[PDB]
Amino acid sequence: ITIGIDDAVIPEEKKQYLEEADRKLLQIEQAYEMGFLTDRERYDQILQLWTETTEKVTQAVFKNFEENYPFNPLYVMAQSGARGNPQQIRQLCGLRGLMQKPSGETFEVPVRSSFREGLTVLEYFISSHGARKGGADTALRTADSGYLTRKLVDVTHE
Amino acid sequence: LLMGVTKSALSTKSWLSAASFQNTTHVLTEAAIAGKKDELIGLKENVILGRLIPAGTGSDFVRFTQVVDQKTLKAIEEARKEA
Amino acid sequence: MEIKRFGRIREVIPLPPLTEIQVESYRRALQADVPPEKRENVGIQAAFRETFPIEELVLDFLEYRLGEPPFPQDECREKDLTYQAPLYARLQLIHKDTGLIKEDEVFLGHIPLMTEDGSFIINGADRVIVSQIHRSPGVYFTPDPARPGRYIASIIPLPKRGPWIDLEVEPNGVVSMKVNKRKFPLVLLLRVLGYDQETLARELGAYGELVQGLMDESVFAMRPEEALIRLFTLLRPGDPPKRDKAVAYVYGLIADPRRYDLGEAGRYKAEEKLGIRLSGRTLARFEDGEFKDEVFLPTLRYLFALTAGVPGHEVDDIDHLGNRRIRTVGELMTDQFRVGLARLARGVRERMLMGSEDSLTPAKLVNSRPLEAAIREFFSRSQLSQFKDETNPLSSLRHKRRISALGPGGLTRERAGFDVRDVHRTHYGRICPVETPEGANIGLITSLAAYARVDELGFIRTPYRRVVGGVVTDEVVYMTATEEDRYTIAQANTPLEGNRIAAERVVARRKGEPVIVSPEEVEFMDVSPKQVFSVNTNLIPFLEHDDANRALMGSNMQTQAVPLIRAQAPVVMTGLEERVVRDSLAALYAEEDGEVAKVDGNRIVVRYEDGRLVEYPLRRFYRSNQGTALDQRPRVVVGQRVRKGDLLADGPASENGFLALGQNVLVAIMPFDGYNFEDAIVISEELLKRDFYTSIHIERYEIEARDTKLGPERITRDIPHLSEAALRDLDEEGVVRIGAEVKPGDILVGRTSFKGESEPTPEERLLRSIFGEKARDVKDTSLRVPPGEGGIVVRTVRLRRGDPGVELKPGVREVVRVYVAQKRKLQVGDKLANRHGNKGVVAKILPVEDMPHLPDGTPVDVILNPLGVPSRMNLGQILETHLGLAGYFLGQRYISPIFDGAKEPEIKELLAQAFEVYFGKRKGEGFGVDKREVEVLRRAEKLGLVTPGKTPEEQLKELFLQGKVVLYDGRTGEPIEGPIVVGQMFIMKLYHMVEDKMHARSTGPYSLITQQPLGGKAQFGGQRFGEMEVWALEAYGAAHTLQEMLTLKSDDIEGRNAAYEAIIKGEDVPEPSVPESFRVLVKELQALALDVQTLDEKDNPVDIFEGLASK
Amino acid sequence: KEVRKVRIALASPEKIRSWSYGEVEKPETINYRTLKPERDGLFDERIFGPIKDYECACGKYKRQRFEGKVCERCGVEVTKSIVRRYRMGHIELATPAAHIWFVK
Amino acid sequence: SMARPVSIGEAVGIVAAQSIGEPGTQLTQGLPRVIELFEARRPKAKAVISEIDGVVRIEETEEKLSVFVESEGFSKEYKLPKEARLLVKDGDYVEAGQPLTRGAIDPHQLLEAKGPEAVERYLVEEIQKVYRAQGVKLHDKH
Amino acid sequence: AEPGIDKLFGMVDSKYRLTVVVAKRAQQLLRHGFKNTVLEPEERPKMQTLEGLFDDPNAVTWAMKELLTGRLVFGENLVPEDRLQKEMERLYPV
Amino acid sequence: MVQVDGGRFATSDLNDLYRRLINRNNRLKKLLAQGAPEIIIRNEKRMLQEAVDALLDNGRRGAPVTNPGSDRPLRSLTDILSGKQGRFRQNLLGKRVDYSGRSVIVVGPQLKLHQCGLPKRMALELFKPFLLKKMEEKGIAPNVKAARRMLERQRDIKDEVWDALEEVIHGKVVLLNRAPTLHRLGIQAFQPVLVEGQSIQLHPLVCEAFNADFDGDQMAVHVPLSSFAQAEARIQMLSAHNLLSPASGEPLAKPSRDIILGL
RNA sequence: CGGAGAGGUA
DNA sequence: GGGCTAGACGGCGAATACCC
DNA sequence: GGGTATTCGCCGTGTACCTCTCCTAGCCC
Ligand SMILES: [Mg+2]
Ligand SMILES: [Zn+2]
């Protein structure tokens, strides 16, 4: 068992899905500028389209692994339950997905690159938001969990 | 009546547990006025006093078990029959 | 070896001096060298002009100067002094009535000086002042949280320089002003400031519906004097509303330029936001006995305009980096100096009434005590003055660039929520989004960017290249965030032909929002990706393939590397290693062209072109603050010709000017018999055989001799009841000789102290009678080596009483210090890590013959677990490993900058080149493919890694181009059933070593009050059995174990004594008793007039004190 | 016996005066020079007990043969020094004062 | 821990408290919901529950909304915000303590309406829902 | 795991009763210097040191093995404590 | 009132509070002895009341009384009783213990499920009294005092004492703990095996229960003394007898990354 | 061998 | 020179605030 | 007089370990 940079296999369907998503986004923009749907509906449909593209590319990644590389190390590590979940495998092989602003709103453009292909400085700075958010979340959750545990212990100690 | 875990813990009858928990001054004043008597029922009180907690091997259900072999038991039985 | 470098982005500017943030700030603050006649109104001069002149005889200030340091730096480090300079001030006292002029230069204490690197020496220790981030003063407008359509107008002066003024539009219509938790209608103060009903009506009339809430006839009736009286009654209830008190209070609250000080940055922010011109740094002025407005009317206008929805009025984000500023060491020192000077001024005012009112000389008036007290307080006890972290030069270089949001006038750990911890959109290019402490301090502590510099006002600026038309110019502009939000900024990696943008559509930013833009709308462009990250993060190659959560740990762990005696620069560098070593000032560089005249392990003598013969002494085997050994090594030879800027001496953890914190090792990625389980690491013994990862550490012990009322303590070779073997290594003066090896228990310094008068117990009287030995009047207080330590003694420092030049603490005759060194090899328990965040402890050290080896016979050194990659998502290490394999087989090093580096096809080409060398060599010596290689090739073609039909050589090449080679098992000899990734990785040895952490205790000291065992490894204490451990033991239902943990191994005194005796006698332990802490609790409760009574089952009292407390 | 209950109740001035072995009347704590305890201070040896086991302050009785005895010279009882951890003092206020716990 | 009848004398309260508290650090509503549930705090956006049985009758003003629970002898009126989502269609019989609006139920009102057993069951289920959503297996016993 | 821990848990109604029985038997064995055992010389617990096989000094192991044999009788209120101690010290002096 | 090793005095704030109270009480007695006007006696009695309040509970009312030249409020009796640093939660529900140790952990794949690798030095320090007894039994030392004076120094240790130590720990167990202890399986009983080095060798399968990884974690060792504690540990707390989690009932000691991968 | 402040590890 | 003296956030319960 | 409604003061917010520094100031005999 080993891990090489070529063990993260990029499927061919990713390019077709991205081109389809680009033409769909162009159609959405053209339909918006004609006054058919407002800004809220445009934002919502963009998010919907990108989520559908993400799930599609995940399915494609896993079908490719299952069909052409049944013994690929990442696929084996995911299937056997030893390490990793489908989302991290997608982030390695597929596309990074959508990142959200610090206020909670989701960015309009997604991170179309993967760690296997390498990001750009802008996308990295974008994902740093969610990274710091999760870190602070854990750091502030630990103390509340401890306090709850102590309260419960002291209420049912007898 | 329904009350949260905090109030339910603070309103207990044993004043040592409530004193060690939270709001020490309030519980201590109320207990001192009421002249309360802690019966050492829970585990925290017995831990504070450094006694044997009433759980596990300290439980009153098994704490008094005796062990004796056949020979000594037979000898004691003979000694009691001749008494 | 050859150095190959990739990348196409050409940077137009080099990095600024990495430590300018401290050095330039302090140099501006002091103004030491500039002639006094031309000093600007900043820093010390500003504080002097602010405090002086004090009326009450009128004392006036003219100028100041700084003397010479009494002792050089190393001397202060030696004798625990503060490296400081004396500050003199030429003051003249003028008698207002007659005209007496008494001018003289008074000594006002000392000021600590900054070293050449940017750190201070306080009491012999190296210290660093950390810059602090906070909210910029000025005027802000925020949305009202509860009432939606309303706004809050805040006016905030400098910290501790005035109160926070709040303005709100109440629901009933009246405008309420809040100061110091006191709310009142703003109309009263508006009347006080000289405003009339007609004036407000004509000014604010554009927005009617709020003017009616502003109109109040009751206050318009009374003159500003009665309004001021009523206002003072509203602010200070209970105080007699005498007119002078009200005037003085309101003046000191608003119009006093000494008590209320809006910032220069604050005044600039106000002029920019409100679009007005401020004559001074106060809200209002006390002129002609009345008050005159400066700020309140325009900000009220702006608020009433905004609340109505006029275009052009926007709320302000309190996290926008145009609203937050940085205080450098200069500003903090100036603030503390101003506080001390104000105390000195009020003291002088006190002395101007007592004493002889005629015979007064400024030497008699001023007392230097408060200024020295304040400055020493700041430099010693302040929350920002931190112990320097100098494990390696990079560590101190990072510490000098750290930015904290805590400290005086800052957030606390409890009041820090999610908002202050987040990454705002304006940190791009100013604050590193990656590097931050992990844990509770996350997000509160950060690091400056690479190209970021701090201007005179305190805002962080970043450079951008100007883009006019479609051509990218070369002149850079340093911009702040407020100015940055007005343009469209392209990215750094856009395609370029010459100076023209070659791409039809570029990726740009507008107010932090990413967008696609046509070239003609591009106004600015980035300089380089380096400007987005800090200095630590800029050293991690292939960063574009690593998750942020792991690059964080990598950046943090690079700081904790230990300087090895055989350090090596990495095989894959980012091109920033030389600048870090040059700016850390660890190394020694040639000043000008010339020739080396003398080179020795102690000093280097250089002859320059000028003819002057310069001599640089090399700091050799010096102990850092953390215990590591810093030393310089000469890298030239006699007769060598050197130019300007060439390397002369190699600093600690550096290899020919390149930063070298670790070593390059041949690592293979595979699981190995469970020894890699969960981040563990297997290493070869070859690393220990050739002295890899060997580091030197220095421990320092200190003992004092002091005067005791029973007689003075003495240091002497004569100690009672010691065999000569224990005194073999001591000299005549009781100190160990330099070079003697010391082990746990041995004596470092012999010291005798007069025996305290005590009656010998009749048992001891019997022993003394039967043995016939007299007890000595002195007893052994010698310093001994603590358990687990030891090594070689290298230096002994001795400072007595009555010896010239040194001073000690009162009561101490002499003090002796001993330095002990030891070479720490790698062993089971030490911590290793690479730059991409992979860390782990060494779990097994195998012999050389058991390690997997390449077919040509070379064995790998380290074995990593592949199961760490997929969940951590740090693929940078795999690419670094491929490139390291290519380099190891080609014999060269590579430089791949961040986000513009070696892509995959170039690595494939390099790997093909390396495979040629690796295979054609074996082919020439008369060897084909091995049988085991053929079997592995078959098994690999069954896996789809190679193409079927090709010859074994072509399949081996196809495997090599993916970074995989065939390995053999050192134990069995058969090959691994599949190809395995192998390559060179750069691994550093961290500072947390098992030798410093292992600890055990059977019995030892106990505390006085609670009679429980002490804590910490230093005092030979025991571990803490916390509350949760008690919960666990209860859940197991183990009652006797818990009872023993609470009494026998604890503060039950007679219980534990009887337990020890019974154990050494062979019986079972006795039954415990009530702990001593419960008795302490009972007595404490009795101290509060509360009777606590223990009772039996029949409610009768039970004495737990055994009549000791019963009369 | 065996501890089975723990009762807590208010303490009358009578029980307080019964707990104490003497009144503290001088704010001094210890002689700064000799390091001996000040007379009638917060650390007095006649009130709270001896410092060294089985030894009076003036040095008249220094053995376990004398226990419970009170030295006439120094006024100290000769017992184990551990009693310095248990015995309590009392201050006699000139005017009554309200316990803050039962007020605020 | 042994898959057999529990032994007399086991400390069950501590085990229950630990089994509930240990997986807390994995809950990304979540932990605040669990906390407000264990403290029986009145929720902020609380639903409305029918105190009495009867048939539902909606009355909708263009600016106001109301629900009428109509029995044979009794009638009860509840005023609701305009945007409050409804979980009952007109002409339906609802039990006492049945939620009308979407949201969290105030435990004290449920106790006054439906009695203790309903509150205990509701609390158990609502606390279990969070650990279920977070993929944490935990017995209802604790 | 311990030898025959399953049969040990089968013998009692509560694991804590088994723990108490084992502890008390071990204390008895320690007090009476192992010469009051119920085991046979061939099944005594053995310990392998550098010299050879010897008697295991751990009393708890002896107690668990003895309980596994089945020649022990344990329960509540079998005999007053003082009478038990007197008869035990009389049969096996110290 | 402790004279620190440096010769300086460290005084509990109780001493300062008592000094202030006795000062004001003597002042009030002296004023009452002379019969001052009502205002002086009044403000003196007010100061006495405030001093008593500060002694019993400082900071409860008004500004907290502090030392001259400091802002730190003095520590009254109430502040000593309550709080996380107070007497209850610090010295009563949790204590420091003897016969304990702490070190770094390292995976050992060769150990059984009920074993743990323990360094020789930590074992020699923890089991010191039993080692002295065993050394007195055999001919290694004449008495326990000579044995202690023999063991006090490291360069005086011969090899027979290692065989004696191996004889001592035969069958005994030690408790391993890792903070934070979230559930009852954070403390587990293991049989020690004397190994070289300075790190604690741990079994792989128990890593999930402790939630411990090998990126530098540390663990604490405790030793139960008497036969009762030894039985309680060997029967109920042994790691080989706790295979199912009390929370859900599903196994905890189950295969993991490398094992599952290989299988 | 008591308390504060700072940094760090898990 | 030493000794002496002077930029959260929630809940919880009582106290008004206020309205009928 | 009563039945809410607000608000104002108090208490509370993880465990374990390691390193270092620093613990009053002024005046007069
Ligand atoms: Mg870890
Ligand atoms: Zn005497």
XYZ file of N, CA and C in Angstrom, chain B residues 57, chain C residues 1025 1032-1033 1036-1042 1044-1045 1049, chain F residues 1-2 5 9 15-16 18-20 22-23 58 60 64, chain G residues 114 171-176 184-185 187-192 222-242:
192
model
N -17.818 -2.101 44.932
C -17.398 -2.913 46.066
C -17.710 -2.269 47.410
N -4.741 13.785 40.284
C -5.905 12.932 40.069
C -7.130 13.839 40.078
N -14.407 8.681 36.629
C -14.123 7.407 35.976
C -14.012 6.280 36.996
N -13.245 6.510 38.064
C -13.081 5.483 39.088
C -14.410 5.137 39.747
N -16.330 2.853 37.345
C -15.861 1.478 37.478
C -16.345 0.796 38.748
N -16.889 1.543 39.702
C -17.294 0.951 40.961
C -16.149 0.473 41.823
N -14.934 0.943 41.559
C -13.765 0.608 42.367
C -13.732 1.573 43.546
N -14.191 1.104 44.708
C -14.295 1.981 45.867
C -12.983 2.065 46.638
N -12.318 0.929 46.854
C -11.098 0.932 47.652
C -9.947 1.626 46.937
N -9.837 1.449 45.620
C -8.830 2.179 44.856
C -9.013 3.683 45.014
N -10.252 4.161 44.892
C -10.518 5.586 45.049
C -10.210 6.057 46.464
N -8.070 4.861 48.510
C -6.623 4.928 48.672
C -6.047 6.132 47.939
N -6.558 6.412 46.739
C -6.094 7.576 45.990
C -6.382 8.867 46.743
N -2.320 7.725 49.449
C -1.373 8.393 48.571
C -1.565 9.901 48.564
N -6.666 -11.927 28.967
C -7.500 -11.743 30.149
C -7.095 -12.708 31.253
N -7.768 -12.611 32.393
C -7.474 -13.505 33.501
C -7.930 -14.921 33.158
N -11.970 -16.166 33.675
C -12.743 -15.056 34.221
C -14.232 -15.259 33.968
N -17.173 -15.006 36.764
C -18.375 -14.183 36.691
C -19.640 -15.028 36.748
N -20.504 -8.905 40.049
C -19.052 -8.907 39.898
C -18.356 -8.330 41.125
N -18.984 -7.349 41.776
C -18.380 -6.744 42.956
C -18.289 -7.737 44.105
N -17.680 -10.918 43.679
C -16.492 -11.687 43.326
C -15.221 -10.932 43.693
N -15.185 -9.631 43.391
C -14.020 -8.823 43.743
C -13.773 -8.834 45.247
N -14.831 -8.656 46.039
C -14.681 -8.627 47.492
C -14.206 -9.979 48.006
N -12.432 -12.232 46.391
C -11.030 -12.412 46.020
C -10.127 -11.596 46.936
N -10.510 -10.347 47.207
C -9.682 -9.485 48.045
C -9.556 -10.042 49.458
N 2.266 -13.308 44.425
C 1.021 -12.560 44.298
C -0.121 -13.351 44.923
N -3.323 -12.451 45.005
C -4.561 -12.368 44.238
C -4.658 -13.520 43.246
N -7.666 -16.267 43.107
C -8.473 -16.550 41.924
C -8.403 -18.024 41.551
N -3.552 -7.074 27.260
C -3.549 -6.703 28.668
C -2.173 -6.293 29.177
N 2.675 -10.103 38.248
C 1.247 -10.170 38.461
C 0.573 -8.856 38.783
N 1.302 -7.870 39.294
C 0.698 -6.592 39.633
C 0.316 -5.828 38.370
N -0.537 -4.821 38.548
C -1.010 -4.000 37.445
C -0.856 -2.532 37.809
N -0.897 -1.688 36.780
C -0.845 -0.243 36.942
C -1.974 0.376 36.131
N -2.409 1.552 36.568
C -3.471 2.287 35.898
C -2.861 3.318 34.961
N -3.294 3.301 33.706
C -2.894 4.280 32.712
C -4.045 5.243 32.474
N -15.480 6.609 31.111
C -14.865 5.710 32.080
C -13.753 4.855 31.490
N -13.600 4.814 30.172
C -12.508 4.064 29.569
C -11.253 4.902 29.359
N -9.344 5.621 31.776
C -8.432 5.037 32.752
C -8.553 3.526 32.651
N -7.442 2.856 32.356
C -7.483 1.413 32.154
C -6.294 0.753 32.834
N -6.495 -0.486 33.267
C -5.487 -1.225 34.013
C -4.723 -2.161 33.087
N -3.399 -2.167 33.226
C -2.532 -2.967 32.376
C -1.477 -3.658 33.225
N -0.977 -4.780 32.727
C 0.174 -5.421 33.349
C 1.454 -4.821 32.784
N 2.406 -4.420 33.619
C 3.607 -3.768 33.094
C 4.632 -4.780 32.614
N -0.381 5.358 37.426
C -0.641 5.270 38.854
C -0.520 3.818 39.292
N -0.212 3.619 40.568
C 0.028 2.292 41.118
C -0.928 2.084 42.291
N -1.827 1.104 42.229
C -2.626 0.763 43.413
C -1.831 -0.123 44.361
N -1.983 0.132 45.663
C -1.074 -0.454 46.642
C -1.591 -1.776 47.201
N -2.752 -1.758 47.847
C -3.170 -2.894 48.655
C -3.799 -3.990 47.803
N -4.087 -5.118 48.459
C -4.680 -6.254 47.763
C -6.093 -5.940 47.290
N -6.839 -5.145 48.059
C -8.172 -4.737 47.625
C -8.111 -3.967 46.314
N -7.241 -2.958 46.245
C -7.112 -2.172 45.025
C -6.585 -3.026 43.879
N -5.658 -3.938 44.177
C -5.133 -4.817 43.139
C -6.228 -5.699 42.558
N -7.097 -6.242 43.412
C -8.207 -7.052 42.924
C -9.179 -6.208 42.110
N -9.539 -5.031 42.631
C -10.449 -4.142 41.914
C -9.916 -3.804 40.529
N -8.600 -3.627 40.407
C -8.021 -3.289 39.113
C -7.953 -4.508 38.200
N -7.499 -5.645 38.733
C -7.283 -6.819 37.894
C -8.597 -7.440 37.444
N -9.693 -7.151 38.139
C -10.953 -7.815 37.829
C -11.857 -6.902 37.011
N -12.002 -5.649 37.442
C -12.992 -4.778 36.820
C -12.363 -3.783 35.852
N -11.143 -3.328 36.129
C -10.534 -2.264 35.344
C -9.547 -2.760 34.295
N -9.294 -4.064 34.217
C -8.371 -4.573 33.213
C -8.907 -4.296 31.815
N -7.996 -3.981 30.894
C -8.411 -3.596 29.549
C -8.997 -4.777 28.789
N -8.565 -5.994 29.119
C -9.041 -7.167 28.399
C -10.480 -7.522 28.747
N -11.037 -6.937 29.805
C -12.402 -7.236 30.212
C -13.397 -6.157 29.808
N -12.936 -5.055 29.225
C -13.807 -3.968 28.782
C -13.702 -3.869 27.264
